[PDB]
């Protein structure tokens, strides 16, 4: 009798924390290239990475 | 039962076959009846059933 | 009626043509399983004009993909209606909501 | 001793808690009896219980079930529909003709179906179809027997020995009378075995069964089903 | 909102319940996910395929 | 036709591929009916029929179950194992101490239990055990008592009074003489309604009794149960 419940599909509790280090992350990628010190390519490929 | 492209068996089960086998062949720590001896299969389906 | 529904259903239902809409608000004089005489309003008649609409129900007729056209009455005799209120409901069609 | 012989489970009391839900308790049983009688019991019931239904319609007014007729608000297949789901008990025979005249404006339900004495309305009030004008006459036979399970339309046109008149419309029979059947067994106290048990049956039925009636019928048809085990050639 | 209002009526609110198997009657191992559904039939009948 | 009339199984075969394995096919039976009636014979026989069987052992020289005995090369469970697997009648009384003891190299023999003139092995040749010592003696005490379905020996390890004296060793209940019972459903095709079920029943007795012989028992017993709802 196995089934597929909505609890089934577990999500990790520590998922929120890396999506804000990544945003971070990002946001602080962003102001840089908006000081000039790296350019669009390098720092979208920072993002991407 | 062998597919001449490459000779790997093409009868296998798929989807709920092997759920079924997995199911059954797996090992949980405190189930019910744990620790005992059996004399064989047929002990094993009448104690199950 | 669908349990679980976007709203979306009275909107495409009244849009569509399958149901029957009344033009005027009134009562509903007559009701029967193939025609409804609804008798519109003192404010809403035209002058020089006897008062009532007349609204004949398709049933039972073929459709293109060789189906049924059925139009079942959803108003009960002397319950007031208004414009833009539904009727008859049309096919696949459960008091003016999409029934698929 | 003990061992070997085995307790008589009985029928204590029957508890009607509606016109349609009962609830039946049998005491006492082993352990492992409760949950073999029971089921077994409520694999029975639900598809092999005879009981009454409607198969023909005839309206003088209509000649095929597809059309309408003046002055009721429903079509002839809702109509037909809602004659489905009525509810008769009929005793002495299986084939019953009843007769109904209704003129006016108001719903018109099984009450005006013309009482008859075998044949009895265990749902008066059940709401057949709805007259909306005054000139409005509408008069219907309506052809009920006795069978078990379901029995389709294509299944019953099958026999067209005689060929049935433009008008009399067939409709779909379900004989079974039982709806809704739920056992629990629990924990019985009698005398200080402190391992008997006993079993609780709910049954949601259309009320032209007796709860009581139902359970000897199903335990006299195991039985009988039964009896060829028994024998074993 | 879900769980909510499941919970405002008599059910759990994982949303899985306990069954029983039809042909044998023995309890079924783990709770399965049953509830109400709306179901479409579609413009392929069999008979007007065979 | 008639509402009370039912179709039965006219058509029962019997197939012997020896005398503990038996396979009886009935057809037709009402549509669902052959799930009912095969699933209460394979309830009735594994947990309802009576039988004799081995409740607890009593070992000379053995004082626990992971004790080992230099004499016999098997284990103590091995040789319970082998104890739990014999089929005993027992008839007459309900329980039944059977002393035995063997002194001589090789296999153990259920032949070898002193005859009590009551009880009866049905597989006298049953190995027991294996000693390889040539001056070991292994003798013991076997308590047999007829009883009703399966009690693992975790649920009889409540009420601890009467075994109190080390030594007695619980074993395996084995009460009920019914192994390796099954049941299946195919479809029976008979005049035009083919929904018809036909069940095939695998029955392996332990020996005591005919695997025909316990099916009817289970029959008679499911009918003298249900005689209070009768007509």
Redesign the interface.
């Known amino acids: 009798g196995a089934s597929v419940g909505i609890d089934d599909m577990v999500i990790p509790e520590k998922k929120h924390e890396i999506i804000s280090e990544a945003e971070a992350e990002v946001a602080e990628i962003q102001e840089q290239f908006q000081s000039g010190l790296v350019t669009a390519g390098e720092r979208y490929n920072k993002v991407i990475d | 039962i062998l597919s001449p492209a490459n000779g790997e068996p093409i009868i296998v089960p798929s989807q709920d076959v092997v759920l079924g086998l997995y199911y059954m062949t797996r090992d949980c720590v405190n189930a019910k009846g744990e620790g005992m001896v059996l004399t064989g299969p047929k002990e094993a389906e009448r104690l199950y059933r | 009626k669908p349990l679980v529904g976007t709203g979306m259903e009275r909107a495409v239902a009244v849009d569509s043509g399958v149901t029957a809409v009344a033009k005027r608000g009134g009562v509903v004089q007559?009701?029967?399983?193939?025609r409804i005489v609804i008798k519109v309003n003192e404010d809403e008649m035209y002058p020089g004009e006897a008062g009532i609409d007349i609204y004949n129900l398709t049933?039972?007729t073929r459709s293109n993909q060789n189906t049924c056209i059925?139009q079942?009455?959803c108003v009960?005799?002397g319950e007031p209606v208004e414009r833009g209120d539904v009727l008859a409901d049309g096919p696949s069609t459960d008091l003016g909501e999409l029934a698929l | 001793?003990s061992?070997?012989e085995?307790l008589?489970?009985?029928?204590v009391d029957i508890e009607q808690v509606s016109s349609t839900h009962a609830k039946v308790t049998l005491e006492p049983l082993?352990?492992?009896?409760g949950?073999?009688?029971?089921?077994?019991l409520?694999?029975?019931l639900l598809?092999?219980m005879?009981g009454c239904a409607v198969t023909e319609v005839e309206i003088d007014g209509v000649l095929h079930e597809?059309?309408?007729?003046?002055?009721?608000?429903?079509?002839i297949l809702?109509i037909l529909l809602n004659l489905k789901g009525l509810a008769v008990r009929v005793q002495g025979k299986?084939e019953v003709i009843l007769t109904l005249n209704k003129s006016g404006?108001g719903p018109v339900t099984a009450a005006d179906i013309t009482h008859d004495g075998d044949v009895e309305i265990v749902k008066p009030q059940h709401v057949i179809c709805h007259l909306?004008?005054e000139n409005a006459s509408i008069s219907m036979r309506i052809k009920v027997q006795?069978?078990?399970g379901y029995v389709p339309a294509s299944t019953r046109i099958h026999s067209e020995e005689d060929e049935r008149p433009i008008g009399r419309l067939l409709v779909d029979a379900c004989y079974s009378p039982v709806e809704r059947i739920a056992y629990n067994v629990e924990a019985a106290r009698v005398e200080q075995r402190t391992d008997l048990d006993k079993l609780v049956i709910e049954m949601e039925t259309n009320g032209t069964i007796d709860p009581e009636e139902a359970?000897?019928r199903?335990?006299?048809?195991?039985?009988?089903?039964?009896?060829?085990?028994?024998d074993?050639? | 909102e879900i769980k909510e209002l499941l919970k405002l009526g008599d059910l759990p609110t994982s949303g899985q319940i306990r069954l029983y198997d039809?042909?044998?009657?023995e309890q079924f191992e783990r709770p399965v996910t049953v509830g109400y559904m709306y179901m479409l039939k579609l413009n392929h009948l069999v008979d007007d395929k065979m």
């Open positions: 007559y009701v029967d399983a193939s049933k039972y059925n079942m009455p009960s005799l | 001793g061992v070997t085995f008589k489970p009985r029928l082993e352990r492992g009896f949950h073999t009688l029971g089921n077994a409520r694999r029975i598809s092999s005879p597809y059309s309408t007729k003046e002055g009721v608000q429903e079509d809702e299986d404006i909306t004008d006795r069978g078990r359970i000897r199903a335990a006299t048809i195991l039985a009988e089903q039964l009896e060829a085990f028994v074993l050639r | 039809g042909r044998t009657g």
